[PDB]
């Protein structure tokens, strides 16, 4: 009755950051030892909580957020961070309690053709609130004239495509990021360690 952490990390495909996937984990036993002791992670940063002391505590729910970003944008997946990813794609609250796990995925998500179907939000009039998902594909009106659905002057498509190429630098290489969030509400607990 172990929690399906393999589904999130050992996933064949990953979602774009603007349409980040979240898997609700509950009513299972979470064995973190199979996760935190792996040496395949480039960054394993935890805030507010310590993974070595998770096999003894309990939580009502656990969330795992999956997306693909650039190496330069892994810095933005952190509380109190600003940037295109942090403001318009995926925002973490300043009081975040959890971990952000990122590993390089150049072998998986890169193509010599110089393009891929990974997208991020480039234009947005206001920043995202924490744990907010905007999957709009409507033309961004940068002026006062209505866009009428056709891209043009002062009317741009809000999304942009990563140019993931195997020859790019480490900063440009695609990274797969999984964000573990722990929820504690006044309710029966459903996720406990071994």
């Amino acid at each position: 009755n172990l929690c399906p952490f393999g589904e999130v990390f050992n996933a064949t495909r990953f979602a774009s950051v603007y349409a980040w996937n979240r898997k609700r984990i509950s009513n299972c036993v979470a064995d973190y030892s199979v996760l935190y002791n792996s040496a395949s992670f480039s960054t394993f940063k935890c805030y507010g909580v310590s993974p070595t002391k998770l096999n003894d505590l309990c939580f009502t729910n656990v969330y795992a957020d999956s997306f693909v970003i650039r190496g330069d944008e892994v810095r933005q997946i952190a509380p109190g961070q600003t940037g295109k990813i942090a403001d318009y794609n995926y925002k973490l609250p300043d009081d975040f309690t959890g971990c952000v796990i990122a590993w390089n995925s150049n072998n998986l998500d890169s193509k010599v053709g110089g393009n891929y179907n990974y997208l991020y939000r480039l234009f947005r009039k206001s920043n995202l609130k924490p744990f907010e998902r905007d999957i709009s594909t409507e033309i961004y009106q940068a002026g006062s004239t209505p866009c009428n659905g056709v891209e043009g002057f002062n009317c741009y498509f809000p999304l942009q495509s990563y140019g993931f190429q195997p020859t790019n630098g480490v900063g440009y290489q695609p990274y797969r990021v999984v964000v573990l969030s722990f929820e504690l509400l006044h309710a029966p607990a459903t996720v406990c360690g071994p």
Partner: antibody
Amino acid sequence: QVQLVESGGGLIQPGGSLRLSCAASGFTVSSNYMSWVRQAPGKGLEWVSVIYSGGSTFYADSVKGRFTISRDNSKSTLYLQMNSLRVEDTAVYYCARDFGDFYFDYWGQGTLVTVSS
Amino acid sequence: EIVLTQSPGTLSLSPGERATLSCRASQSVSSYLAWYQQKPGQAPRLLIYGASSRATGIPDRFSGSGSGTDFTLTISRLEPEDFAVYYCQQYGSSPRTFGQGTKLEIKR
């Protein structure tokens, strides 16, 4: 049509403050990236600061902590607070419309700021 | 800090000739380069974005080529108004930086 007109440049003693205004036309300033670029009186272009469409502000290392970029939607004007000016800050400051923190598609006429005792 | 080195410092060509301008980078930017033209007394005007895509209102005689660390701006059939200082700007890494610029003069 897009117009960008700048104001607020002039002589100022070292350490004194100054504010540069940028009147904008043809687009909404609250929805576009906008940047300030300064060109030295003889040297090349240097990006100073940028304000995102969502309101985030980023500054260069040589101006961080001293320069503050701001916008007024009601007046459709871009601002740049200078605060602790230095002689090395003497340049012509340009107001440019930024396209997603990538490149500057439109530029203002530029205003000259001279900092010297 | 990533430095964009432009060559030559100044270029002298007659109208109607072909101008080739170079812009090399400290690191690879992978086509995240822009080209600007600045006539004396005026602000820079955008010419090329994406290191190959032409900005609106720019004649076909301006073309961008190259990727990674090597980039080229070519102007064919030079017109007397096409002579100014041309700067290349990279946007592949913060801070966004410009080159020294290449002066383009007519020849007599």
